[PDB]
Design a protein around this ligand. Structure first.
Ligand SMILES: [K+]
Ligand SMILES: [K+]
Ligand SMILES: [Mg+2]
Length: 349
C-alpha cells in the first residue's frame, strides 16, 4: 500500500543458518556526540530505554549468529552478555584498544555451532605511525553441529572520512586474518561471512575492492576511498604501497614473512553483498544509519559466493525518507542510529 514502512523477508543435504549484523550505538559514544541526536526525544536516548528495545529485537529475529558493533564494555558485562547467554548464545568480545569504551562481538547459538578458534585483530600498531587508531576486528571459526567450518568476521572501521589510507589498511588487516583462519587443508577457503560497519558507502573504492577483489588506487585521494561526505579538496593521494613493509601484509592482503632490507590491491576471496543497496522499482538508495548529519549505507553482510553459500532471504532495508517519517534514529521504537541487517544462508552439503 502507498506509504507503508515495513521491513519484509525477501526470498531470493544442507545446513541453513541466519546472521544478524547490528551497530547498537554505544551509550558513551551517543552522549559524546549529542549533536548527532538533537532530533531525538530526550527520553528515548537513555540506556535504560534503549537496551530493552535492542534485546527485544535480537530476541524477535532469533538469529543463529550475531555480529554486533559499538558494544560497550561495562554494559556488555553487566547486561548484554548475560542476556544473550540466557537466549542460548555463546559470546566473544573484542574491545577497541586505548581509551575507547566499545568493541565488536560475535555471538552464535551453541545448538547450531561449536567454536574452533577465536582470532582477534587489533588495527593499532605502535610500531607503525600510520596505524595509530584504536579500531578492531574479530574472526571466529565455527563448526556447524550436524561439513566444512564457517569463518565469521566482524569489524568496525575508522569513521574519519579523510583517512582512507587507514581504512584500507585496517580492511587489509581483517582480510589477512580471514585468509589465515579460513584456509583449508585442500587449499581452498571455507565459507566466509564478513559483517560490520565499514564506514564506507556502496560503490566507493573500498566497497568495490571488497566486491571485485581488485582496486587500482593510482591517483586516489585519501578522502575518496570511503565515499563518505568529504571536502574532496587539498587531500594527499594514497602512497604506493599504501602501508609499509613492517605491517607484514602483501598487496594481495595476505600475511607474509617479512625480510630485512604497482598501485593495485587484490584479495583472493569471491564475496557478494547480501543487500543490493538500491530499491529496484525506484532506484532510491537503501540506508543503514540515519541521524542528524548522515543517512547512508555503511553496514554490510558480505559472504562467499559463486566455499560458496546460497543466500536464501534477507530482511529488507529502508530509505532515508522512510526513516525521517519516523523522526530519525534512534527513536522510541528503533533504539540504535543504525538498522540491523539480517540474512538467511544455505550451505549445500
Ligand atoms: K592459516
Ligand atoms: K590530506
Ligand atoms: Mg556510531
Amino acid at each position: 500500500h502507498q506509504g507503508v514502512i515495513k521491513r519484509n523477508w525477501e526470498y531470493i543435504n544442507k545446513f541453513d543458518f541466519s546472521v544478524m549484523s547490528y551497530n547498537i550505538l554505544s551509550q558513551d559514544l551517543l552522549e559524546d556526540n549529542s549533536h548527532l541526536y538533537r532530533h531525538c526525544r530526550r527520553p528515548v536516548l537513555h540506556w535504560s530505554f534503549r537496551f530493552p528495545n535492542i534485546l527485544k529485537e535480537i530476541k524477535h529475529f532469533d538469529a543463529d549468529v550475531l555480529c554486533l558493533q559499538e558494544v560497550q564494555e561495562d554494559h556488555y558485562g553487566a547486561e548484554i552478555r548475560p542476556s544473550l547467554e540466557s537466549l542460548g548464545y555463546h559470546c566473544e568480545y573484542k574491545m577497541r584498544t586505548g581509551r575507547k569504551p566499545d568493541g565488536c562481538a560475535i555471538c552464535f547459538k551453541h545448538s547450531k555451532f561449536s567454536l574452533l578458534s577465536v582470532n582477534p585483530v587489533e588495527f593499532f600498531r605502535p610500531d607503525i605511525s600510520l596505524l595509530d587508531r584504536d579500531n578492531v576486528g574479530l574472526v571466529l571459526l565455527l563448526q556447524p553441529k550436524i561439513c566444512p567450518a564457517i569463518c565469521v568476521a566482524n569489524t568496525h572501521l575508522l569513521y574519519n572520512p579523510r583517512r582512507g589510507d587507514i581504512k584500507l589498511t585496517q580492511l587489509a588487516m581483517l582480510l589477512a586474518e580471514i585468509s589465515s583462519v579460513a584456509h583449508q587443508k585442500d587449499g581452498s577457503f571455507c565459507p566466509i561471512v564478513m559483517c560490520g560497519d565499514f564506514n564506507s558507502v556502496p560503490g566507493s573504492p573500498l566497497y568495490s575492492f571488497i566486491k571485485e577483489g581488485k582496486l587500482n588506487y593510482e591517483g586516489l585521494p585519501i578522502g575518496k576511498v570511503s565515499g563518505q561526505e568529504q571536502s574532496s579538496r587539498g587531500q594527499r593521494i594514497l602512497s604506493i604501497p599504501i602501508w609499509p613493509p613492517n605491517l607484514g601484509i602483501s598487496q594481495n592482503c595476505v600475511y607474509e614473512v617479512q625480510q630485512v632490507p604497482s598501485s593495485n590491491l587484490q584479495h583472493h576471496f569471491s564475496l557478494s553483498s547480501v543487500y543490493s543497496h538500491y530499491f529496484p522499482d525506484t532506484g532510491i538508495p537503501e540506508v543503514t544509519t540515519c541521524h542528524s548529519r548522515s543517512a547512508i549505507t555503511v553496514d554490510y553482510i558480505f559472504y562467499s559466493a559463486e566455499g560458496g553459500l546460497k543466500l536464501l532471504a534477507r530482511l529488507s532495508l529502508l530509505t532515508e525518507q522512510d526513516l525521517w517519517t519516523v523522526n530519525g534514529l534512534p527513536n522510541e521504537n528503533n533504539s540504535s542510529d543504525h538498522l540491523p541487517l539480517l540474512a538467511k544462508f544455505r550451505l549445500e552439503l
